[PDB]
Write an enzyme that holds these catalytic residues in place. Structure first.
Site, PDB file in Angstrom:
ATOM      1  N   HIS A  32      -7.461  -2.636  10.457  1.00  0.00           N
ATOM      2  CA  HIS A  32      -8.183  -1.845   9.427  1.00  0.00           C
ATOM      3  C   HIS A  32      -9.253  -2.866   8.695  1.00  0.00           C
ATOM      4  CE1 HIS A  32      -6.836  -2.264   5.519  1.00  0.00           C
ATOM      5  NE2 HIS A  32      -5.612  -1.767   6.002  1.00  0.00           N
TER       6      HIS A  32
ATOM      7  N   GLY B  69      -7.518  -5.181  -1.403  1.00  0.00           N
ATOM      8  CA  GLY B  69      -7.535  -6.263  -0.947  1.00  0.00           C
ATOM      9  C   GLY B  69      -6.134  -7.187  -0.990  1.00  0.00           C
TER      10      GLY B  69
ATOM     11  N   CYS C 149      -3.896  -5.971   1.262  1.00  0.00           N
ATOM     12  CA  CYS C 149      -3.492  -5.640   2.566  1.00  0.00           C
ATOM     13  C   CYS C 149      -3.437  -6.999   3.272  1.00  0.00           C
ATOM     14  CB  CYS C 149      -4.863  -4.946   3.174  1.00  0.00           C
ATOM     15  SG  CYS C 149      -5.871  -3.887   2.077  1.00  0.00           S
TER      16      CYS C 149
HETATM   17  C1  LIG Z   1      -4.591  -2.636   1.379  1.00  0.00           C
HETATM   18  C2  LIG Z   1      -5.397  -1.533   1.105  1.00  0.00           C
HETATM   19  C3  LIG Z   1      -6.886  -1.635   0.715  1.00  0.00           C
HETATM   20  O1  LIG Z   1      -7.019  -2.622   0.124  1.00  0.00           O
HETATM   21  N1  LIG Z   1      -7.507  -0.723   0.724  1.00  0.00           N
HETATM   22  C4  LIG Z   1      -9.164  -0.703  -0.004  1.00  0.00           C
HETATM   23  C5  LIG Z   1      -7.121   0.838   0.967  1.00  0.00           C
HETATM   24  C6  LIG Z   1      -7.457   0.948   2.236  1.00  0.00           C
HETATM   25  N2  LIG Z   1      -7.156   1.947   3.462  1.00  0.00           N
HETATM   26  C7  LIG Z   1      -7.463   1.694   4.586  1.00  0.00           C
HETATM   27  C8  LIG Z   1      -7.015   2.800   5.781  1.00  0.00           C
HETATM   28  F1  LIG Z   1      -5.832   2.497   6.037  1.00  0.00           F
HETATM   29  F2  LIG Z   1      -7.088   4.077   5.249  1.00  0.00           F
HETATM   30  F3  LIG Z   1      -7.780   2.779   6.783  1.00  0.00           F
HETATM   31  C9  LIG Z   1      -8.340   0.613   4.725  1.00  0.00           C
HETATM   32  S1  LIG Z   1      -8.654  -0.098   3.158  1.00  0.00           S
END
Ligand SMILES: C=CC(=O)N(C)Cc1nc(C(F)(F)F)cs1
Ligand SMILES: C=CC(=O)N(C)Cc1nc(C(F)(F)F)cs1
Lengths: 305, 305
Positions: B41, B143, B145
């Site tokens: 993503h 961030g 992730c």
């Molecule tokens: C690691 C999480 C993060 O930083 N955030 C902004 C939440 C997000 N969630 C998505 C998804 F899985 F719904 F596509 C993309 S980013």
């Protein structure tokens, strides 16, 4: 979001841990530039530790009596000295992995990361605080001596603790990197009084702010209080008295949440008088005091090193 | 002695964290040999994340659309692919810091160390468990992730988790390093049911053994019980049912302490039926379930890597 007790990344410190052996005793050392620091009781046998004459013991020792090993690499010892309760061993090589670093002596109530080591190899990392009575509640098996505590501020490692002893009561005691013990403790095997501990009030307030930030709000009151009224209850419950310096340090969290510090004190008062009623705050059924205000801000800011 | 929630030393993993940017999104990646792994993503804009067509989005992307940076070092991307919910970016250079490593998919109830990162830089390390419902209770700001979870067995890094999302309920969800989500979760921004969680019974028993080893014994009974009788109480209190496999795994701790496993179950039963009476066990006012039997043995053995 979420809130966890979180240690600093330990890479920079892993590359400084060495094994120090003297006679029979082996413990860990810290190799920075061309010096290795380690507890001076590495020169003690198990008969000496009741009341050792460290000067007389160190005098029987020469450079070649100290074996320093960095993984497989043996280091050549070209000088030795005793500074308070640590040995400083001069080695012919500079640690190529030496980080930028300072030696600092922390205050009671501040936190640091511990890298527990055995035989010079890292085994794990965890966060803890310098208790008001200058002990720490760690995890230190025999041979963990020489393990160090530290903080990291973007690339700089502030070393603040070196582990020396477990007290008969199961808590731990050590020195700053200049060899001065935190607290009234000495490096000999005797019964030593740590003294009444207290709870780090400002840290508990930071943690309650951490909880509001993360959704746990059930403990917020329709009440407020005064610095002096609250300190009355702090006394009864063995909390550190709160000061205006503490109130200032909580400013940033007061502003982020919109909850006045004294209002938060009012919430703490009621939690102290009425317990928690089998409820939980950030997954804990007691009042946690090992997060500084700086700790809380770091987690919610996402600061990196 | 002492008992602490303890993460693995994070050095070996620090040297594998990189920054991955695609269009506007920046998150962390894992650079092992000549491949960089990161959540897929990263190719989503904030409009896509409600229901993204990842194949169609990845098709608009070419190698040069992916910016990979290791500290200051830019990496040249010479290939890209999607494996389940992760991107595998082939880079022209092998990470000189690649540790010996495996990709493993852990079971619910096992533990691992998390190195939370932002913009490819490590910010802290902490231990957590794969809950029975396949979430984790971490500390993951936006961030984070691409942050990874791992175990270390003397020099070998078993990567088991990569962070993807925070659920609306404040808990966290991610994949194994092959991109398969733990649990029923998908990488899109919608309400997703984690499902009833339960307590990892075997871990609680290991932690009670950890407590006896360290002096906390007030909870030991004059009672015993049966596997089936105890599981009756496990059901009522939402504990995982205990099996003979669990009893076997607790053998080493049964032998070190001389307390039969079913006797320990009897102590757990009474703690579940009568609470803890405002007492504490290893500094906690609730029953802790994030230590595996292997975790407890490691701390009391002093294993190093
Ligand atoms: C690691 C999480 C993060 O930083 N955030 C902004 C939440 C997000 N969630 C998505 C998804 F899985 F719904 F596509 C993309 S980013
Ligand atoms: C790091 C502690 C350790 O490993 N042990 C065996 C306890 C020791 N205590 C002493 C002292 F301080 F009493 F001299 C020397 S070793």
């Amino acid at each position: 979001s979420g809130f966890r007790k979180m240690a600093f990344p330990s890479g920079k410190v892993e590359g400084c841990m060495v094994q120090v052996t003297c006679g029979t005793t082996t413990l860990n050392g810290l190799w920075l530039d061309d010096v290795v620091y380690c507890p001076r009781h590495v020169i003690c046998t198990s008969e000496d530790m009741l009341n050792p004459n460290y000067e007389d013991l160190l005098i029987r020792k020469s450079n070649h009596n100290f074996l320093v090993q960095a993984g497989n690499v043996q280091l050549r010892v070209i000088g030795h000295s005793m500074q308070n309760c640590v040995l400083k061993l001069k080695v012919d090589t500079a640690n190529p992995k030496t980080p930028k670093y300072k030696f600092v002596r922390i205050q009671p109530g501040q936190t640091f990361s511990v890298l527990a080591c055995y035989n010079g190899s890292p085994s794990g990392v965890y966060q803890c605080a310098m208790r008001p009575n200058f002990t720490i509640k760690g995890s230190f098996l025999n041979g963990s001596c020489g393990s160090v505590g530290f903080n990291i501020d973007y690339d700089c490692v502030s070393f603040c603790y070196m582990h020396h002893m477990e007290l008969p009561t199961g808590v731990h005691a050590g020195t700053d990197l200049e060899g001065n013990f935190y607290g009234p403790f000495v490096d000999r095997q005797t019964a030593q009084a740590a003294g009444t501990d207290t709870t780090i009030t400002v840290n508990v307030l930071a943690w309650l702010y951490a909880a509001v930030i993360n959704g746990d709000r059930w403990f917020l009151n329709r009440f407020t209080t005064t610095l002096n009224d609250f300190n009355l209850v702090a006394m009864k419950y063995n909390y550190e008295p709160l000061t205006q310096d503490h109130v200032d340090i909580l400013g940033p969290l007061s502003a982020q949440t919109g909850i006045a510090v004294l209002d938060m004190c009012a919430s703490l008062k009621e939690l102290l008088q009425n317990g928690m009623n089998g409820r939980t705050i950030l997954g804990s059924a007691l009042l946690e005091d090992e997060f500084t205000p700086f700790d809380v801000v770091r987690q919610c800011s996402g600061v990196t090193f």
